[PDB]
């Protein structure tokens, strides 16, 4: 058995969830919840603009109806993402066509936050994808319904790269940065998954029609030289496929799951080679392991529940209870509640479990924006999760 075969989900008790939250009812295939070691954020239902909630992680229990929110946007927020290099900075993309970057005080909001640090204006339609660069300071990608990808230097406010509708002629379903941020992987409604070096726009690999169905495909980078997709058969059977980007003629493995209409969002953990799959409308979270042993993609198990998810966040490693063998933590949105679900490896030790917790991508950038734009690549600067290792301060 995999060392991860008996990984299991454990929902937090009511006193450790966040209750009575006005979760956004907008129909959109993003997570709607973004969390980091300091804060939980989720997108709110707002009828006169855009808003999302940010709370210190410790502020569990019922949320006051008059809680201060992050506002500024003039139409519904579609996507939120925390900066991997600063636990106080979050970006939001909105139906108002802007991306706004916010700084959150330690201790959380005292008053509504209405003015962002910077507003990034350039999309001409709603912005439903934001993604921070994993290794280069201040670099942020957005993709809008104008089918344009912009890359921004948030330190200057400038749009520094543009991939136009000649690159993605139809809706962009997903964009993922590679481990070192030297590439992006995009999945498009024109049924092509592209691996692109975004500084020059070079398409270095492309898979035409990874799935036969008419519903969306999402794609992520996984272990080196490999990508994973979720999609549908012609008859709407949901599927997960693992691909070798050097040999895209057929997948390394294609696995049929069930028959739903819900889009499965993949979450890949490089530290364990586990991929989790969760879709809006489902009550379950499936997980697989990726190995170099054929058939390469291996099913592990599934977390089951009685409640359908309306969104899902995912805690960075620095937020996990390493001493309790927690290897992931999901933040599940359902109805008016945000519910943490620990993913745990059943072990019993007082010692730091090195095999479960290799050094992990840390909060200090490996490159400046200008260094990266000038063509330098670098993997993330790694840190130890062991008690006693103090993470770098954010810039």
Swiss-Prot record:
Post-translational modification: Polyubiquitinated by RNF128 with 'Lys-48'-linked chains, leading to proteasomal degradation.
GO molecular function: actin filament binding; actin monomer binding; cytoskeletal protein binding; identical protein binding; myosin heavy chain binding; phosphatidylinositol 3-kinase binding; protein homodimerization activity
Task performed by this protein: May be a crucial component of the cytoskeleton of highly motile cells, functioning both in the invagination of large pieces of plasma membrane, as well as in forming protrusions of the plasma membrane involved in cell locomotion. In mycobacteria-infected cells, its retention on the phagosomal membrane prevents fusion between phagosomes and lysosomes.
One Gene Ontology CC term in the entry: phagocytic vesicle membrane
Family annotation (Pfam families): DUF1899, Trimer_CC, WD40, WD40_4
Record PANTHER family: CORONIN (PTHR10856), CORONIN-1A (PTHR10856:SF18)
WD repeat coordinates: 6-56, 66-103, 116-153, 157-197, 200-244, 251-289, 295-342
Stated family: Belongs to the WD repeat coronin family.
Keywords of this entry: Acetylation, Actin-binding, Coiled coil, Cytoplasm, Cytoplasmic vesicle, Cytoskeleton, Membrane, Phosphoprotein, Repeat, Ubl conjugation, WD repeat
Location relative to the cell: Cytoplasm, Cytoskeleton; Cytoplasm, Cell cortex; Cytoplasmic vesicle, Phagosome membrane
Statement: the UniProt record of this protein carries the keyword Phosphoprotein: yes
Known tissue expression: Expressed in spleen, lymph nodes, thymus, brain and at very lower levels in lung. Also expressed in cells of the lymphoid/myeloid lineage. Not expressed in Kuffper cells.
Location (main, coarse): cytoplasm
Name of the featured protein: Coronin-1A
């Amino acid at each position: 058995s995999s060392k991860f075969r008996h990984v299991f989900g454990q929902p937090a008790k009511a006193d450790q969830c966040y209750e009575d939250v006005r979760v956004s009812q907008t129909t959109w295939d993003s997570g709607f919840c973004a969390v980091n070691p300091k804060f939980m954020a989720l997108i709110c239902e707002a009828s006169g603009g855009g808003a999302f909630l940010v709370l210190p992680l410790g502020k569990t229990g019922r949320v006051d109806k008059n809680v201060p929110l992050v506002c500024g946007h003039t139409a519904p927020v579609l996507d939120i993402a925390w900066c991997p290099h600063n636990d106080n900075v979050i970006a939001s993309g909105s139906e108002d066509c802007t991306v706004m970057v916010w700084e959150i005080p330690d201790g959380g909001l005292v008053l509504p936050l209405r003015e962002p640090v910077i507003t990034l204006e350039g999309h001409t339609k709603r912005v439903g994808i934001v993604a921070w660069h994993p290794t280069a300071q201040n670099v942020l990608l957005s993709a809008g319904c104008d089918n344009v990808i912009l890359v921004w230097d948030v330190g200057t406010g400038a749009a520094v790269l543009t991939l136009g509708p000649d690159v993605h002629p139809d809706t962009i379903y997903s964009v993922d940065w590679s481990r070192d941020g030297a590439l992006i992987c995009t999945s498009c409604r024109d049924k092509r998954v592209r691996v692109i070096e975004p500084r020059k726009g070079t398409v270095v690999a492309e898979k035409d029609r990874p799935h036969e169905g008419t519903r969306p495909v999402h794609a992520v980078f996984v272990s080196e030289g490999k990508i994973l997709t979720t999609g549908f058969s012609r008859m709407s059977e949901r599927q997960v496929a693992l691909w070798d980007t050097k040999h895209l003629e057929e997948p390394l493995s294609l696995q049929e799951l069930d028959t739903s209409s819900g889009v499965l969002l993949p979450f890949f953990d490089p530290d364990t080679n586990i991929v989790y799959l969760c879709g809006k409308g489902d009550s379950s979270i499936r997980y697989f392991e990726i190995t170099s042993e054929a058939p390469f993609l291996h099913y592990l198990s599934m977390f089951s529940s009685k409640e359908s998810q309306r969104g899902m966040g995912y805690m960075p490693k620095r937020g996990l209870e390493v001493n309790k063998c927690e290897i992931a933590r999901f933040y599940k949105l359902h109805e008016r509640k945000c519910e943490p679900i620990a993913m745990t490896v059943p072990r019993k030790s007082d010692l730091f479990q090195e095999d479960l917790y290799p050094p992990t991508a840390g909060p200090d950038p490996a490159l400046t924006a200008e260094e990266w734009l000038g063509g330098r690549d670098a993997g993330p600067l790694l840190i130890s999760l062991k008690d006693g290792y103090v993470p770098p301060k954010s810039r």
